[PDB]
């Protein structure tokens, strides 16, 4: 029985390929077709396709075409020496709010001022002078930000293999693979150190990383309980409407209607115990005979250490130091309320000049909202990092970090890849061609 080569056409062999997926949403409105009214899904069966959420070529497709639509809605610096002082007053301590000098011819809260001093003889009077935080940055443009559940769909000729195994870890094989032409609701909300309005899991809290035994790799933690948060600004600002230029607007809002209550947040301490208690129970598995110590973040730029929000159109920077702040020797221990349970707060600062889109560098201006601001979201994910230190005595310290901006989207695109169908394949058999 001599074998012979035979070519077949219609083989189900797959090949991972890249493409330019198109958006889809209900209602930000350019190039996005409406959602599919018939979201078909076919379970393949006994297939084991090796996934890899870290080497995925879809996260780059989402990181791009989102700075692109962001730039389409932003199509100016005027850095002059300011002059201000402390405001006339869980309480606000120092929040400078004043007006500047000459605009063309003859209120910047706290993280957008840089102190200076002239060379005159006014040093005996203590006359301070400020400057904008992005005075020497490339382009400072000026403009509602509401996340819409964008759906990425595959083009003609390509498919999407969505796994369904509830025990994901990031890489390795899957056992329940199904094909879909689109995806679930993806909220493009930007934030650091915490993932807001994400997607909960189906089993216990799972962690995932490219190499858990490495320190530079981001450790994405997906929860299974929508921990709520209540961040609000109890102040009241009024639109100044300063016009500078031939038909140009600017809004350096501010009013004294009791500027003493500092904007903060509220997190359920009872719910926060059950979350971290299950996380340490999972981290102890990969890290045996060790103490999972949580600690304060790093330093440098103020937009790194703090959490980034978006509440109705204003950005909040909150000190996340009261969060995690413990040692956690064994599983589910080391509590600290002594019978309190009094809503652990987070003091927050508010910026106006935003170093928009981490990686390139092109700031923008956020127009303030007239009145009180109140928002509420669900803390569903967590970004972490491990400090590789030689003083490791069974205490591997973890920090919130924040990592790259792409890590906020790898926690939602970890379930699928884009494949191409190669239809021809060869195989040997016993037939022979007549000649």
């Amino acid at each position, epitope marked *: 029985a001599k074998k012979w080569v035979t070519v077949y056409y219609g083989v189900p062999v797959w090949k991972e390929a890249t493409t330019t997926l198109f958006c889809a949403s209900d209602a930000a409105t350019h190039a996005c077709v409406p959602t599919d009214p018939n979201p078909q899904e076919i379970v393949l069966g006994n297939v084991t396709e090796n996934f890899n959420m870290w080497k995925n070529n879809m996260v780059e497709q989402m990181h791009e075409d989102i700075i692109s639509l962001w730039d389409q809605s932003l199509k100016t610096p005027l850095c002059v020496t300011l002059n201000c002082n402390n405001v006339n007053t869980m309480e606000t301590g120092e929040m400078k709010n004043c007006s500047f000098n000459v605009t063309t011819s003859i209120l910047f809260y706290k993280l957008d001022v840089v102190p200076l001093e002239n060379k005159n003889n006014i040093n005996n009077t203590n006359i301070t002078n400020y400057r904008l935080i992005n005075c*020497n940055t490339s382009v400072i443009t000026q403009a509602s930000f509401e996340p819409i559940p964008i759906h990425y769909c595959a083009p003609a000729g390509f498919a999407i293999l969505k796994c369904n195994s509830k025990t994901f870890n990031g890489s390795g094989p899957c056992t329940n693979v199904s094909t879909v032409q689109c995806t679930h609701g993806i909220r493009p909300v930007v934030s650091t150190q915490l993932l807001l309005n994400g997607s909960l899991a189906e089993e216990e809290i799972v962690i995932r990383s490219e190499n858990i035994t490495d320190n530079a790799k981001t450790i994405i933690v997906q929860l299974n309980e929508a921990v709520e948060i209540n961040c609000t600004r109890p102040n009241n600002n009024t639109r100044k409407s300063i016009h500078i230029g031939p038909g140009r607007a600017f809004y350096a809002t501010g009013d004294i209607i009791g500027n003493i209550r500092q904007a903060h947040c509220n997190i359920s301490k009872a719910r926060w115990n059950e979350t971290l208690g299950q996380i340490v129970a999972k981290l102890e598995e990969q890290f045996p005979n060790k103490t999972i110590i949580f600690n304060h973040s790093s330093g440098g730029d103020p937009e790194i250490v703090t959490h980034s929000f978006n509440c109705g159109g204003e950005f909040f920077y909150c000190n996340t130091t009261p969060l995690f702040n413990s040692t956690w020797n064994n599983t589910r221990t080391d509590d600290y309320p002594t019978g309190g349970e009094q809503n652990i707060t987070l003091q927050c600062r508010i910026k106006q000049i935003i170093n928009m889109w*981490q990686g390139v560098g092109k700031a923008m201006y956020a127009p303030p909202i007239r009145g009180q601001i109140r928002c509420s979201s669900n803390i569903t994910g967590l970004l972490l990092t491990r400090d590789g230190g030689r003083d490791q005595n069974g205490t591997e310290t973890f920090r919130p*970090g924040g990592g790259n901006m792409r890590d906020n989207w790898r926690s939602e695109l970890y379930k699928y890849k884009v494949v191409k169908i190669e239809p021809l394949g060869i195989a040997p058999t016993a037939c022979k061609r007549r000649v």
Partner: nanobody
Amino acid sequence: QVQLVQSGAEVKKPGASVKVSCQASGYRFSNFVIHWVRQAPGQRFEWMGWINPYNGNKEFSAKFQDRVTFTADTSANTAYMELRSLRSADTAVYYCARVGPYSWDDSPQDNYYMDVWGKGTTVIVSS
């Protein structure tokens, strides 16, 4: 521990492009700002600018406006410094520094005092 290791010496002809590199080891390079200063034998130190590898924010001094460019690699934990033009007066020892941590009770620029330096590389224009 925190340590910055620079590259070796690089003797180049006047009009070339010297590429001085930095390397972060004991911390997360994507969270701190890196400074570059210059030191000539007998002269004083002189600031050359800084780069923010987190958001890509770059700021260089007016003296080196169109002569020195800054580039950084986040995934490799290395900061680079390119030079457009050269001159025999640029024969100096280049450094590399790292800013300090940010505290909750200070201005956004009170923590850029160059905590950790680096083993300074030297460049010669004409030997």
